[PDB]
Design a protein around this ligand. Structure first.
Ligand SMILES: [Mg+2]
Lengths: 785, 266, 233
């Protein structure tokens, strides 16, 4: 909302300056996006009266003869250059802001043009450039410089929130500043009506979508250009002046956030009918577009006998036919409150957004209609010398706002302030509220234009913004939290340590979008996405990720192309969506690996990633194990399932080569788990102060037998005295019976209370040897010191 | 074929000492109550360790602490404001001195917790050490009252042992607080009252020492119209009964077979 | 004294809009550019593990979690809920569709605006120093009244930074909480309490505090960008 300074100043006469006004408005809750300066009019631009306009033969140009103090002539091809109007003449020599060039006397089709009449755009007072500025013929003495009648203006571009629709009118803003202490000069409706019947009637066919409608009658109209003061005001407001009557309606709308429209009686017929549009009903709206009304569009319609025609789109835009033009002599003034919801839908529907719809969606003073009529009518009388009928046609009866109970004590209790009772009630009163009661609990009834004042809290905010948020003191609360809130953060804390332990080990954190390309479910061989968007940013972002890894893999490629990393070890914790929303942990290792830079021997791939994971798991103090199992996306030969504390939580393996090939990537190893991991408490086990007993043994096993199965066997059989079991050698070849391998194991037996007798170790290593062979395994070695 | 169950490369995995875990657990509890952790020196001067805290020469109170005295030339002990502090050197018998060092260098209000290693000349047994750790707090400001002290310890109990935990306070003597008290927590799962530590309202003479010393260094006095409370507790005691460590001698014993058990504890 | 609790990213219109006083066809709804979701066989569960029914969406703010918390816990308490939020927008050097917010909520007998100003004051002091000062001005939010926007005086940048919004929880938010509690068989708990809430953007801080020029780096996943923050604790 452009709030033109000199205009607002007409209601709040004491405003210090635009800079102060901006500061004032900030504290009231309105922030200005910018402050522009606007009418730098040169002295070379003068006011001239067009005495006669002669067409130049064989051209579309005209030779205007102007009284500009001296009689000069100007050539113009403007569709509206005509005698009997005032124009802004740019005398030769004038440098123009708008056309950026210098105006000069010049020969045009046989006539020497002394300068040029200007369009809103060339003068720089507006964007419109389709015609000459039209001032009343006698606005000023021919020759007197425009600047003198059209001074610069400072315009503030305010942000006006949805809760304050009343601020979409300058008077609305003025009443707020008034509560601060400024003087309010409300304009008076100087009307001289005359009792006579209205020549038309009103029929509201939908009082649900038009709860209050009023029509006024003005006749004997003399449509002409608006006074310079009204032209300047409208231009500053971001609006272009049309003529006498249409301008009054734009001026009063901005003045009070009450859109209104004048209809030429000629097109009304017998009366106005507010009703819904009929199927396929059409309307050529002001914009020139012939639209097709939808059955849910509220419409202002006129009827004649048994015909009802659309005159305009209710509270959005008027028809181009009934628009007030030059020959119009009598009109019907529409001033009403429409249902926000209805106007909203119709506006969206037709892709329209006008100053009218804009204010109707937010809301309008349910009882401001009549006063708006008197204001506009009064001006029409003053500007277009209209004769105005006394009676108005009114439909609807809105109930005034309801009273709200106010406890000054509670106001202070909620803010933590201590503004005195009296001081609070005076604020409420300055704002226009009617306060009833003697206290402690008052009955405060808000003005009809403050749609936002319904609860007591609403009222306490009023005391606060007028007193100033700066006046609210600082303080800290002290209390014991209710029992169920204790320990409430354990989870968040647990996951945050997980990330920390991960970065500690050496993993680099990555953030990836929650969105997934549906096609990827294919590229990676996963079940399709369960949640898809109805309004995606793009097709490749049309689904919610079911897995984490696909994304990591992509950022990996993206990195390789931009920079050529020799290696990477990433990790990500994030939400994943499938059946239920769940948190996952996933990582990926790629590249050369770990080792001496200046040497070739390196640790890498599967067993390196499995290392960082076993390391990770010892720190979390959990039991970790990998059993082989196939996964569509994994590589058959390097694919396994992760078993944390005995349960399957995810996988680990090498990316399937085919997927690798399609995406042009080198091999990559990765894993994905489902958080939160099991929680295992501390069971302190007092270590034995007695010496361990060592023993080495090898097991001959058929090549396909998994190391994990052997390990479990030796372990389960070793007894309660086994302390450590470790694999030190993996061999398979001669003279080992072919198709077999050997697993070397360092074992350690330790008895808690006392030292072990050799017969105990021996007998124990026998239970292993026994069950080892009962499974069909051989003993390449045992009882080695 | 690649055997996925084969052990991967053997990278090392660390762990934290039981005491660091426990200390960390207590500091975060107080951080949530607005307390900041500041540390102090282990080698102190008799002034800050005894004299300023109302524990004078040849006085019964001095017998409560079995001091390790120190001798050594060319050692610089520096006071709160980097000044050379003169006194007979010793290994601190409690963390309390740091509370005087803090007060002389800062102005109220504030809330602090100072964890630290302390020493006492004693014969080390299954429940006695000569080197162990304490944690002391101090809140100073206008209007701080004993009710606020009971509230803090209440919050400590709730955080360590649950909602069904309750604290108990009884009178006891300390030269540096009056009123003075000892507090115990109802450990619901152990079904018994645990004596955790001491606390009380800072003694008038401790504030006088602080200001008098501030004045000596050119600082204006700041503890004239304030009150304050302080408490102090043993860490090993908690750490043992919370992690189930039977012998206090394990803590400094450095046995990997003992320390490794606490790898999983965060 | 604030505890951190997280909430789901995929929410229901009830918790994200309706309970927080932001109804259908209402100007306020326009402040949030919602990503709506479709998908069969997805279970969204409410505060007490109940199947919550509503039209699904990606949360446009963390606020819903504050209703989820209130229905499942009883006052007094203080919470902070960090989280990823989504908005349908065209991603530019200072705009993202996916970003993070952090919202707080303190509820109890006697909580007043003074306490809100105090918290933000402590936030400013902690982020930018003792010579930092906060500023509050009126603004509108459907779920708070009074409502406000706060800015911090960043002394080294010599300018006021607009950080976020805050206000006193709206009467209608507490009614929604209890009414829903009653629906699930829980007794009401928010009858005689007051409370304040604030919410702020993380990226905004992160950028001006670490000096990151383009908001698009955050989700860009470039190792050359991320590695620079290895030293930051
Ligand atoms: Mg309000």
């Amino acid at each position: 909302m452009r709030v033109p300074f000199s205009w607002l100043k007409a209601y709040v006469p004491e405003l210090e300056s635009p800079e102060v006004l901006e500061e004032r408005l900030a504290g009231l809750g309105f922030e200005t996006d910018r402050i522009e300066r606007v009418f730098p009019i040169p002295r070379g631009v003068v006011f001239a009266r067009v005495l006669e306009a002669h067409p130049i033969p064989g051209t579309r140009l005209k030779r205007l003869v102007l009284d500009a103090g001296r009689t000069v002539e100007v050539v113009s091809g403007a569709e509206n250059a005509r005698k009997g109007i005032g124009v802004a003449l740019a005398l030769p020599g004038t440098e123009l802001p708008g056309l950026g060039q210098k105006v000069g006397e010049r020969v045009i089709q046989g006539v020497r043009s002394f300068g040029m009449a200007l369009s809103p755009r060339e003068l720089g007072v507006g964007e419109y450039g389709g015609g000459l500025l039209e001032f009343p013929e006698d606005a000023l003495p021919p020759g007197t410089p425009l600047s003198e009648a059209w001074p610069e203006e400072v315009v503030l571009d305010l942000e006006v929130t949805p809760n304050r629709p009343d601020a979409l009118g300058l008077l609305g803003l003025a009443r707020d500043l008034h509560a601060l202490g400024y003087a309010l000069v409300e304009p008076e409706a100087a009307l001289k009506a005359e009792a006579l019947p209205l020549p038309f009637a009103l029929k509201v066919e939908d009082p649900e979508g038009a709860p209050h409608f009023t029509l006024g009658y003005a006749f004997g109209l003399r449509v002409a250009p608006s006074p310079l003061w009204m032209q300047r005001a409208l231009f500053a407001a971001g609006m272009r002046p049309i003529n006498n009557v249409v301008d009054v309606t734009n001026y009063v709308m901005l003045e009070r956030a009450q859109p209104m429209h004048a209809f030429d009686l000629r097109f009304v017929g017998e009366g106005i009918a507010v009703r819904r549009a009929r199927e396929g009903e059409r309307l050529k709206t002001l914009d020139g577009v012939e639209r097709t009304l939808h059955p849910e569009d509220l419409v202002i319609a006129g009827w004649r006998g048994e015909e009802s025609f659309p005159l305009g789109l209710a509270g959005v835009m008027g028809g181009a036919e009934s628009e007030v033009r030059e020959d119009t002599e009598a009109i019907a003034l529409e001033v009403a409150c429409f249902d926000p919801v209805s106007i909203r839908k119709t506006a969206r529907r037709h892709g329209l957004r006008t100053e009218a719809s804009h204010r109707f969606e937010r809301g309008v003073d349910p009882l401001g209609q009549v006063p708006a009529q008197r204001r506009a009518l009064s001006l029409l009388q003053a500007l277009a010398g209209a004769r105005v009928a006394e009676a108005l046609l009114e439909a609807g009866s809105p109930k005034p706002p309801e009273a709200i109970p106010f406890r000054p004590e509670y106001a202070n209790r909620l803010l933590g302030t201590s503004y005195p009772e009296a001081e609070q009630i005076a604020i409420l009163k300055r704002l226009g509220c009617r306060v009833e009661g003697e206290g402690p609990t008052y009955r405060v009834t808000p003005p009809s234009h403050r749609l936002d004042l319904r609860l007591e809290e609403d009222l306490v905010e009023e005391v606060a913004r007028i007193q100033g948020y700066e006046t609210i003191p600082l303080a800290l609360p002290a209390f014991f939290p209710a029992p169920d809130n204790r320990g409430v953060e354990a989870p968040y804390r647990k996951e945050q340590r997980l990330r920390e332990v991960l970065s500690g080990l050496g993993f680099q954190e990555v953030y990836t979008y929650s969105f997934m390309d549906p096609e990827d479910a294919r590229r990676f061989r996963l079940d399709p996405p369960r949640l898809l968007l109805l309004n995606p940013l793009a097709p490749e972002k049309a689904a919610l990720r079911t897995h984490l890894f696909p994304g990591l893999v992509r950022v990996l490629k993206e990195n390789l192309d931009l920079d050529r990393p020799e290696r990477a070890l990433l990790f990500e914790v994030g939400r994943v969506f499938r059946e239920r929303e769940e948190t996952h942990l996933a990582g990926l290792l790629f590249g050369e690996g770990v080792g001496l830079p200046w040497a070739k021997e390196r640790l890498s791939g599967y067993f390196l990633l499995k290392g960082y994971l076993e390391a990770l798991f010892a720190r979390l103090g959990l039991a970790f194990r990998v059993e082989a199992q196939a996964f569509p996306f994994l590589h058959p030969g390097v694919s396994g399932r992760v078993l944390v504390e005995g349960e399957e939580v995810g996988f680990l393996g090498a990316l399937h080569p085919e997927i690798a090939q399609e995406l042009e990537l080198p091999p990559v190893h990765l894993f994905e788990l489902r958080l939160p991991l099991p929680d295992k408490p501390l069971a302190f086990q007092d270590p034995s102060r007695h010496p361990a007993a060592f023993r080495d043994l090898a097991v001959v096993v058929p090549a396909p037998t998994p190391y994990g199965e052997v390990e479990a066997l030796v372990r389960e059989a070793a007894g309660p005295y086994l302390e450590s079991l470790a694999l030190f050698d993996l061999y398979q070849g001669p003279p080992l019976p072919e198709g077999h391998k050997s697993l070397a194991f360092h074992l350690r037996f330790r008895h808690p209370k006392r030292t072990l007798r050799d017969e105990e170790v021996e007998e124990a290593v026998s239970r292993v040897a026994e069950a080892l062979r009962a499974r069909g395994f051989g003993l390449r070695g045992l009882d080695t010191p | 074929r690649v055997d996925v169950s084969l052990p991967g490369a053997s990278l090392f995995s660390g762990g934290l000492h039981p005491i660091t875990l426990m200390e960390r657990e207590l500091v975060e509890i107080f951080r949530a109550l607005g307390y900041q952790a500041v540390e102090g020196p282990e080698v102190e001067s008799e002034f800050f360790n005894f004299d300023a805290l109302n524990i004078p020469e040849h006085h019964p109170a001095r017998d409560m602490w079995d001091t390790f005295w120190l001798t050594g030339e060319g050692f610089r002990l520096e006071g709160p404001l980097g000044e050379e502090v003169e006194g007979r050197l010793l290994l601190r018998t409690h963390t309390s001195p740091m509370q005087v060092r803090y007060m002389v260098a800062h102005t109220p209000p504030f809330r602090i917790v100072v964890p630290g290693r302390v020493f006492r000349f004693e014969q080390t047994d299954a429940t006695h050490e000569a080197v162990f750790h304490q944690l002391e707090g101090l809140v100073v400001g206008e209007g701080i009252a004993m009710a606020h002290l009971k509230g803090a310890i209440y919050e400590l109990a709730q955080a360590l042992f649950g909602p069904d935990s309750k604290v108990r306070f009884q009178p006891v003597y300390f030269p540096f607080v009056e009123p003075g008290a000892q507090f115990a927590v109802w450990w619901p799962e152990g079904g018994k009252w645990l004596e955790l530590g001491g606390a009380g309202m800072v003694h008038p003479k401790v504030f006088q020492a602080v200001d008098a010393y501030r004045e000596r260094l050119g600082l204006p006095p700041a503890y004239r119209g304030v009150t304050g409370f302080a408490f102090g507790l043993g860490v090993e005691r908690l750490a043992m009964l919370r992690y189930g460590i039977p012998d206090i001698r394990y803590f400094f014993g450095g046995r990997l077979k003992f320390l490794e058990q606490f790898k999983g504890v965060l």
